[PDB]
């Protein structure tokens, strides 16, 4: 249960990364990027100065 | 995209068709309960949506407290034995707790389309039910519809679907729907082109034959609603600021600027002046909200109030294009992004209480503080200082002490009462009043009487107040604005042009009698009588008032007582004052 | 008339279900429709005439929309056996039309 | 079992995203995008108007 669940934790770090990158996508298309512005575009680078 | 449930989700209404519009009524007041024809875009709601946003809730209790309530009064010359009195108080309050039980079941419940389901209004914690049954507001098939927590017979909903798409016996999440009926019949409903002078277009909806589209969207969840979180749909007071200070905007010398008074009388978390001004932020993008965006939220800290929330640019020097003043919001401008420390990393789950770094995004920096302006004379306070337009990082912490809904709600009780009485202050200053205006004003005035203690009812004079007087800060929020006016109504009702008197005309109008009105000023005197006790800040605003006493016474016575108361205590102052 | 083929009013369904990431088998309950190249949305109502009648007046739709709205889509599933009965039907009618020609 | 399975649910949201994006790929290369137309181419832005 413990090795299984720790690798599951590895998929949890996978979860946080695979979510942070596209929450990053939201924050960026909106305002990077932012305002105002312008554009276009891209550029260059720037650087510075010294 | 998304959207699945109901109840514990919580959202407005948008009757939007003809006449189109969001569904609300400002203040408690108690008011000519209504809707807004002026409305706003689906995407771009009027700022009042903060009032518009209704709270869904399963039908509940909806029974014997009607009995407790209707047992309260009728008789000849007749009453009822006290065992019925108190024991049926147990009927009452235990029924309250019954409602507490099913509302513990509340968040659990999922609405299906066509369920009778009940609604409420968080911004007042009230809901409509009247009438049919109760007396009409004039119209074709004239009928009133208001709001209360009575939860009584008529509310209760109409079994709730129609159109064609989508037959009864299933789940409706977001769409538009046929809403409430009275049990007394009770649908259809108004769309109306019927309102009066205090407001522009201001119709409403009930009873009478008329089809209508409705419903709302993404607002609150079973997730977010409990508790603290960032209550995005109902955010409270503006402040980053930990410099022993919690700055928030105010008008000054005919200028709107973020500010705070000196020292804050020490402390921070401690309750203070409501110079705030607060609230409103989540989007994908769209009008839909609910506050569920967690720390990677990108969402506004606009004030009540009203106006922007601006601060940004580069940092004696000019600082044009920076700190907040006036609306419009919309667009993208000082939108802000929070930077929780939590334990920093990949966190993406519900900000709360603990507060850390803030940064507007287009400026990418970072709301500083300190570094002191002057405001010419004072000095005391000297301090409008911030509304920052930074460049780089640093130290101070953000966000908001969560504030219980009930007392910002008390502001709705407050500034609203102040305005609606400012108007009638404009009425009886001309000397005119309807006896209906009389009963209304004394009604809300008595609402002050039991706004004293928690004892809502009934015929209880002033001695009960005497214990309540030490209790509740009330008096300070009272002072926050309203105090300017009651006493004014003590003034000009006698005064201009010739409604008195002197002692002669005030009493002859008093000797001929309704009942409260002679006591009304006395009652205003009675509520200031609630007010003078304790802290000194409720005292100096008796300065003019004791001249007003000679016244018052014137017548018767008462016033015375107161013163014583104051014384016782105171013484011283007373012483111182017165013386012469 | 035909031809079908190509890409032309291909349509894309918009189930409400409970809207989200759903990707599994439409059924019975019906919601929004939208052709893709036009990106909108098959409305209805709004009435033509057909000259005389009136009764029925109603060719009205075959819509060429612009934006969203209200009405619902798709099909009452129909048991194979009776459309099969149409195969029993119109076919019998044609094959007997021929011998009627005989 | 419950934490394990909930994180499995997190990989189910991962599933729906990782499928929606490329079903999005199908719908788009075909007609965005769509028709007719023309171309070429681218442009610017546109825005518106006003």
| DSSP result, B256-321 | EEEE--SGGGS-SSS-------B-----SSSS---STT-TT-------TTTS-----S-------S
Q: Which of C12, C23, C36 sits opposite D19 (nearest CB)?
A: C23
d(CA B75, CA B238): 51
Contacts of B239 (CB under 8 A, 6+ apart): B245, B246, B247, B248, B276, B399, B400
**DSSP SS3 for B548:** coil
Q: Is C69 left (phi over 0), alpha (psi -120 to 50) or beta?
A: left
Within 13 A of B343's CA, how many CA atoms are on the CB side?
0
Query: What is the crossing angle of helices B483-492 and B516-531, to 10°?
Result: 150
A23 touching B, CB under 8 A? yes
**DSSP SS3 for A14:** helix
Closest CA to B124 of B431, B379, B520, B416: B416
C79 touching D, CB under 8 A? no
Under 8 Å between Cβ of B91 and B106:
no
Under 8 Å between Cβ of B213 and B162:
no
Under 8 Å between Cβ of B292 and B233:
no
Contacts of B480 (CB under 8 A, 6+ apart): B273, B274, B414, B415
Measured in whole angstroms, the distance separating CA D25 from the mean position of its chain's CA atoms is 7
Q: Judge residue B515's burial from the number of C-beta atoms within 10 Å of its C-beta, 0-12 exposed, 13-18 middle, 19 or more buried.
A: exposed
Q: How far is B340 from chain A (nearest CA, A)?
A: 15
As a whole number of Å, the end-to-end CA separation of chain C is 30
The two three-digit tokens of residue B1, written as one number: 């995209």
Residues in chain A within 8 Å Cβ distance of D8: 8
d(CA A6, CA B2): 30
The two three-digit tokens of residue C42, written as one number: 């098959």
B43 touching C, CB under 8 A? no
The two three-digit tokens of residue B54, written as one number: 């209704």
Closest CA to B424 of B200, B201, B198: B198
Instruction: Give the Cα-Cα-Cα angle B254, B390, B351 (nearest 5 degrees).
Output: 95
Instruction: Give the Cα-Cα-Cα angle B97, B99, B100 (nearest 5 degrees).
Output: 55
C10 to D31: CB separation less than 8 angstroms, yes or no: yes
Residues β-bridged to residue B338: B358
Alpha carbon of B352 to those of B52, B229, B248, B399, C19: distances in Å? 26, 5, 20, 9, 30
d(CA B283, CA D4): 31
> Tokens 């689906």, residue?
B42
Which value in Å is the resolution of this experimental model?
A: 4.7
C71 touching B, CB under 8 A? yes
Residues in chain A within 8 Å Cβ distance of D3: 5
d(CA D19, CA B104): 38
Under 8 Å between Cβ of B187 and B207:
yes
Closest CA to B354 of B422, B284, B401, B405: B401
Closest CA to B50 of B382, B296, B371, B416: B416
**String of b and e for B9-32 (b: at least 16 CB within 10 Å)?**
bbbbbbbbeebbbbbbbbbbbbbb
Give the helix/strand (H/E) hosting C32.
strand C32-34
B331 touching A, CB under 8 A? no
Strands B337-339 and B256-259: unpaired
Measured in whole angstroms, the distance separating CA B275 from the mean position of its chain's CA atoms is 15
Strands B337-339 and B357-359: antiparallel
| φ and ψ of B250, to 5 deg | -155, 155
A11 touching B, CB under 8 A? no
Contacts of B200 (CB under 8 A, 6+ apart): B37, B38
Query: What is the C-alpha R_g of chain D?
Result: 19
Closest CA to B499 of B556, B554, B549, B432: B432
* Alpha helices by DSSP H, C8-61: none
Q: Tell me if the bond preceding B317 is cis, omega within 30° of 0.
A: no
Under 8 Å between Cβ of B183 and B131:
no
d(CA C87, CA C77): 17
CB-based contacts of B342-345 (< 8 A; 24+ apart in sequence): B342/B295
Under 8 Å between Cβ of B130 and B144:
yes
Residues in chain B within 8 Å Cβ distance of A27: 296, 298, 337, 361
d(CA B46, CA B280): 12
**DSSP SS3 for C75:** coil
Query: What is the crossing angle of helices B516-531 and B435-452, to 10°?
Result: 30
Q: Judge residue C74's burial from the number of C-beta atoms within 10 Å of its C-beta, 0-12 exposed, 13-18 middle, 19 or more buried.
A: middle
| φ and ψ of C60, to 5 deg | -140, -25
Counting one residue from B and one from C, how many pairs have CB atoms under 8 Å apart? 26
Give the helix/strand (H/E) hosting B405.
helix B405-428
Alpha carbon of C90 to those of B455, C76, C81, C94, C95: distances in Å? 81, 21, 14, 6, 9
**DSSP SS3 for B56:** strand
Residues in chain A within 8 Å Cβ distance of B335: 31
Q: After which residues, if any, is chain C broken (C to N > 2.5 Å)?
A: none
D27 to C36: CB separation less than 8 angstroms, yes or no: yes
Under 8 Å between Cβ of B12 and B289:
no
The two three-digit tokens of residue A50, written as one number: 């010294």
* Residue B429: CB atoms within 10 Å: 17
Residues β-bridged to residue C33: C13
**DSSP SS3 for B250:** strand
Under 8 Å between Cβ of B409 and B123:
yes
Q: Tell me if the bond preceding B305 is cis, omega within 30° of 0.
A: yes
Contacts of B451 (CB under 8 A, 6+ apart): B413, B474
Query: What is the C-alpha R_g of chain B?
Result: 26
The two three-digit tokens of residue B98, written as one number: 């019954």
A19 to B348: CB separation less than 8 angstroms, yes or no: yes
Residues β-bridged to residue B14: B22
**DSSP SS3 for B329:** coil
Strands B256-259 and B248-251: antiparallel
**DSSP SS3 for B523:** helix
Residues in chain B within 8 Å Cβ distance of C18: 3-4, 171, 173
DSSP B135: P
Structural determination approach = cryo-EM
DSSP B37: S
Chains adjacent to C (≥3 CB pairs closer than 8 angstroms): B, D
Under 8 Å between Cβ of B474 and B530:
yes
Q: How far is D2 from chain A (nearest CA, A)?
A: 11
d(CA B524, CA B537): 18
The two three-digit tokens of residue B412, written as one number: 């709705």
Closest CA to A27 of B373, B187, B293: B293
Contacts of B323 (CB under 8 A, 6+ apart): B257, B258, B310, B311, B386, B387, B388, B389
Contacts of C88 (CB under 8 A, 6+ apart): none
Contacts of A19 (CB under 8 A, 6+ apart): B348
**String of b and e for B56-72 (b: at least 16 CB within 10 Å)?**
bbbbbbbeebeebeebe
**DSSP SS3 for C85:** helix
- Binding residue ranges of B for 1D-myo-inositol 1,4,5-trisphosphate: 261, 263-265, 476, 479, 535-536
B170 to C29: CB separation less than 8 angstroms, yes or no: yes
Residues in chain B within 8 Å Cβ distance of C16: 173, 175
Under 8 Å between Cβ of B336 and B358:
yes
Give the helix/strand (H/E) hosting B359.
strand B357-359
Within 13 A of A10's CA, how many CA atoms are on the CB side?
6
Q: What is the dihedral of CA B335, B290, C29, B189, to 10 degrees?
A: -110
* Alpha helices by DSSP H, chain C: 80-100
Contacts of B59 (CB under 8 A, 6+ apart): B116, B117, B118, B151, B155, B156, B157
């Amino acid at each position: 249960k413990l090795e299984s669940t720790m690798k599951l934790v590895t998929n949890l770090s996978g979860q946080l990364s695979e979510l942070k990158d596209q929450m990053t996508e939201q924050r960026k298309q909106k305002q990077r990027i932012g305002l105002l512005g312008h554009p276009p575009h891209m550029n260059v680078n720037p650087q510075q100065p010294a | 995209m998304s959207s699945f449930l109901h109840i514990g989700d919580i959202c407005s209404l948008y009757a939007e068709g003809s006449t189109n519009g969001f569904i609300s009524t400002l203040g408690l007041v108690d008011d000519r309960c209504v809707v807004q024809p002026e409305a706003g875009d689906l995407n771009n709601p009027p700022k009042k949506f903060r009032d518009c946003l209704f709270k869904l809730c399963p039908m509940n209790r909806y029974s014997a407290q009607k009995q407790f309530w209707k047992a309260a009064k009728p008789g000849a010359n007749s009453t009822t034995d006290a065992v019925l009195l108190n024991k049926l108080h147990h009927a009452a309050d235990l029924e309250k707790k019954q409602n507490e039980t099913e509302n513990r079941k509340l968040l659990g419940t999922v609405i299906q389309y066509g369920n009778v389901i009940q609604l409420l209004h968080l911004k007042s914690n009230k809901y409509l039910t009247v009438n049919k049954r109760l007396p009409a507001l004039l119209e074709k098939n004239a009928m009133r519809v208001t709001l209360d927590e009575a939860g009584n017979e008529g509310s209760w909903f109409y079994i709730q679907p129609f159109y064609k798409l989508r037959s009864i016996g299933d789940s409706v999440v977001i769409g538009d729907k046929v809403v409430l009926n009275p049990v007394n019949a009770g649908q259809p409903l108004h769309a109306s082109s019927h309102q009066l002078v205090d407001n522009p277009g201001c119709n409403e909806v009930n009873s009478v034959n008329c089809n209508t589209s409705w419903k709302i969207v993404l607002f609150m969840k079973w997730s977010d609603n409990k508790d603290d979180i960032l209550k995005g749909g109902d955010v409270v007071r503006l402040f980053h600021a930990e410099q022993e200070k919690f700055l928030t905007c105010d008008e000054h010398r005919k200028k709107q600027h973020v500010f705070l008074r000196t020292t804050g009388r020490q402390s921070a978390t401690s309750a203070t002046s409501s110079k705030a001004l607060w609230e409103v932020e989540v989007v994908q993008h769209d009008p839909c909200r609910g506050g569920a965006g967690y720390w990677n939220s990108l969402f506004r800290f606009k004030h009540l109030a009203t106006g922007h929330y601006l601060a940004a640019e580069v940092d004696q020097e000019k600082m044009v294009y920076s700190l907040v003043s006036v609306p419009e919001g919309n667009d993208i401008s000082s939108i802000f992004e929070l930077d929780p420390t939590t334990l920093r990393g990949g966190d993406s789950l519900v900000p709360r209480n603990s507060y850390v770094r803030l940064r507007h995004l287009c400026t990418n920096t970072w709301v500083h503080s300190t570094n002191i302006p002057i405001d010419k004379e004072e000095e005391k306070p000297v301090m409008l200082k911030i509304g920052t337009s930074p460049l780089k990082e640093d130290k101070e912490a953000f966000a908001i002490v969560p504030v219980s809904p009930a007392e910002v709600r008390d502001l709705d009780f407050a500034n609203d009462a102040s305005k609606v009485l400012g108007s009638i202050a404009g009425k009886l200053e001309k000397g005119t009043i309807t006896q209906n205006e009389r009963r209304s004003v004394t009604k809300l005035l008595e609402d002050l009487v039991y706004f004293v203690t928690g004892g809502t009812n009934s015929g209880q004079d002033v001695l009960e107040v005497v214990f309540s007087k030490p209790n509740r800060e009330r008096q300070k929020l009272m002072r926050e604005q309203n105090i300017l006016k009651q006493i004014f109504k003590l003034l000009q009702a006698p005064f201009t042009d010739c409604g008195d008197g002197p002692m002669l005309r005030l009493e002859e109008l008093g000797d001929q009698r309704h009942a409260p009105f002679r006591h009304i000023c006395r009652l205003c005197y009675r509520v200031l009588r609630h007010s003078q006790q304790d802290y000194r800040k409720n005292q100096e605003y008796i300065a003019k008032q004791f001249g007003f006493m000679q016244k018052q016474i014137g017548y018767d016575v008462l016033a015375e007582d107161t013163i014583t108361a104051l014384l016782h205590n105171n013484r011283k102052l007373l012483e111182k004052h017165i013386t012469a």
